[model samples]
Target: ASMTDQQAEARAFLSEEMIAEFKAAFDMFDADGGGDISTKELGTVMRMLGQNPTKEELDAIIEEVDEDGSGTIDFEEFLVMMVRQMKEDA
Candidate 1:
């Protein structure tokens, strides 16, 4: 069986050694256990960054990071979002 775009991105970047740790990180934020991180989940993370964000703000962040417009971040989406942030900062 073949993987989708998100799964491909997740597999392409991380080593097998990193998959466990990466999944752990994703699972922690997937607050609802729905297998995807929603804007609401990102809101929790941003609040930890000291910003009291509205749902609109969080949705904006998703709009920036979400490639497939899935309204949720899967593993590959998470990987891409993190890597994209690093590149922009770099």
Candidate 2:
């Protein structure tokens, strides 16, 4: 997982239409206008979606998606994780 080109990585598996759709979805979860999904909003959204995750699990999930170690997930990071999950479940 080189930090250099996650753009290419995400683009390879997702179409432009899909990317736009994902961006809209990401924005919905990215409350507070921070431009990234923080753990607070993530937890809120997860529970709203009916999944109740513990704090540790929330941190772990963010760690899994947080390639830059910013402790939050931006759009690219979110898309990358999405691609991985989509591939895995496909």
Candidate 3:
């Protein structure tokens, strides 16, 4: 389904929020701020978030959404992927 004009605007707003949240979450995960999230880092984040994704699952999810495979999810890629996910849910 296509987005209505208002729905597009709302999604845009929500996407901005999602991007901010993603940055915060990523920063927390990248404690040392080296800019790449390793398996250990991912596990820590998952545990904190009450998620239990296996290392492979974490790798897959990261790979799928990371776009550039930078091992870090930058804001633009994250925002686009998250907005797509949110739209799919709606």
Candidate 4:
């Protein structure tokens, strides 16, 4: 089996321990078991982390990663986001 780019990104910079942590964070907000997270949940996550970002601001960030305007973040998308942010911070 071959690992896709997204899969590679997800595993990059993540220890097995950190992988579970990320999944747990995503699952926490995926309230409906939809397997994807919506903008509303994204907002909740930011708030939970003790940061307050306006809806518009969050929407803009989501918009950048959101392909197809689906307004949802799948696991791969979340992983991509993490990788992207890590790269940016480096």
Candidate 5:
């Protein structure tokens, strides 16, 4: 499933345009286009963004979003994280 249509739940809370923007960001970290973001990819983005987060820290993040224990970040998970982040920032 390169793309999961199960994004309806996310879409319910986010505008279509916002979802696209988030997908673009998610795709950046999902370099392999595997539909899931691994800690390795998250680390790369984290470092480039100026934070050299530890593996465990990354793992914790993955754990939080990896509801199914898939050990990776699904697009739905990413969207939910983004939504929470935006609300927190407000």
Candidate 6:
């Protein structure tokens, strides 16, 4: 569906809010900050969110979202994936 200008602007605003929310989630994952979240860290966050991801699941999730392959999810990549995922779920 094509979006009107107002709708587009609203979507952008919501996307920005989603990004902020995802950034908070990412920060929670990157507890130590060191610029990288290990698989263990990811697992911990997932568990906290009531998702008990296995190591393989954690690895896949990290690989899928970690665009830079830096072993961590930076804010931008996390925001992009998260906004799309949230929109789809909604």
Which pairs clash in the backbone of model 6? none
TM-scores of all models?
0.51, 0.60, 0.39, 0.57, 0.57, 0.45
Pick the winner on TM-score between candidates 1 and 2: 2
Cα error, residue 49 of model 2, in Å, equals: 11
lDDT of 1 at 15: 69
Ranked by TM-score, top first: 2, 5, 4, 1, 6, 3
* lDDT for 35 (candidate 6): 40
TM-score of 5: 0.57
In model 5, pairs of residues that clash are none
Clashes per candidate, residues 3 or more apart or on different chains: 0, 0, 0, 0, 0, 0
Worst 10 residues of 5 by lDDT: 1-10
lDDT string for model 6 (1-90, tens) is 222332334336564655455455567857665444564465554355333556765667676655444666544433333333344445
lDDT per residue as tens, model 3, 1-90:
232333345337564655455566656756554444553465454345333555665566566644544656443433333444345453
Error of 6 at 84 (Å): 2.5
lDDT of 1 at 6: 47
C-alpha local distance difference test of each model = 0.55, 0.59, 0.48, 0.60, 0.56, 0.49
Report the error of model 1 at residue 83, Å. 2.4
Model 2 spans > 4 angstroms off: 39-61, 64-69
| Order of candidate numbers by lDDT, starting with the best | 4, 2, 5, 1, 6, 3
Better of 2 and 3 by lDDT: 2
Off by over 4 Å in 6: 1-15, 34-36, 39-61, 65-67
Distance from true location, Cα of 85 in model 2, Å: 0.4
Candidate 4 lDDT (Cα, 0 to 1): 0.60
**lDDT of residue 32 for candidate 6:** 64
lDDT of 5 by residue, 1-90 (tens): 322433445455766876666555667767664667774575554344333546776667656555555766666655544443344442
Better of 2 and 5 by lDDT: 2
